[PDB]
């Protein structure tokens, strides 16, 4: 049943959040999945609300792979969770735990947390942009049928189980593709720093202790 996999519908469910990530290349609308990755969703929404991501660059842009942002240092070495130095129950100093779900996958459009090892989630996030038909390459036995089908349109299945997925692009995939396109023949294109202008929380979500 495709309804068990919330990335397969653009409709924002009762227990889903919604944001608009305004970028120098256009607006990307994402829904988030606090039911399955509550730490990554709270971390991202809280940083977004406080302006932590404002004017940050997409510091990694790799065509047919993913686009990545959320590093105040702009080179992949920085960023921290909202709990670093504040709540050791959530972040002991090196980041928060991965949140792997059998309902969420690195299909094209998936929003995920970057990490420097399992359970080192800070503030860096990436959007899966790959467009390769990944269906045949999958170990079918280990993937739900609806997800094998969805992987026809692209994704990074090698990342499944290793990184938290916590959202999905529901509008503006063309913007994600335009950002990714800047890595193609970059030797013949003008220098360009792509930035997040702001993140508008359309439908917030909050968490209980």
Author numbering: 60 to 268
What does the study report here?
Here, we solved the protein structures of two secreted parvulin and two secreted cyclophilin-like peptidyl-prolyl isomerase (PPIase) ATP-independent chaperones found in gram-positive streptococcal species. Two types of ATP-independent extracellular PPIases exist in pathogenic streptococci: the parvulin and cyclophilin families. Unlike cytoplasmic PPIases, extracellular PPIases have canonical secretion signal peptides that allow for their translocation across the cell membrane via the Sec pathway. These chaperones are lipidated to the outer leaflet of the membrane and function in the space between the bacterial membrane and cell wall.
We then solved the crystal structures of SlrA homologs from S. pneumoniae (SpnSlrA) and S. pyogenes (SpyPpiA) to 1.88 Å and 1.28 Å resolution, respectively, using single-wavelength anomalous diffraction (SAD) data from selenomethionine derivatized crystals. Superimposition of chains A from the SpnSlrA and SpyPpiA structures confirms that their structures are homologous and share good alignment with an r.m.s.d. of 2.08 Å. Both structures also contain extra secondary structural elements adjacent to the β-barrel composed of residues 189–212 (η2, 193–195; η3, 203–211; η4, 215–217). SpnSlrA putative active site residues Phe184 and His221 are identical to hCypA residues but are substituted by Tyr in SpyPpiA. SpnSlrA, SpyPpiA, and hCypA all catalyzed the cis-to-trans isomerization of the N-succinyl-Ala-Ala-Pro-Phe-p-nitroanilide substrate. However, we observed ~20% decrease in PPIase activity of SpnSlrA and SpyPpiA compared to hCpyA. These data indicate that Tyr substitutions at key putative active site positions allow for PPIase activity in, at least, one streptococcal cyclophilin. Using affinity isothermal titration calorimetry (ITC), we determined that SpnSlrA and SpyPpiA bind to CsA with a dissociation constants (Kd) of 122.4 ± 41.4 nM and 365.7 ± 102.1 nM, respectively.
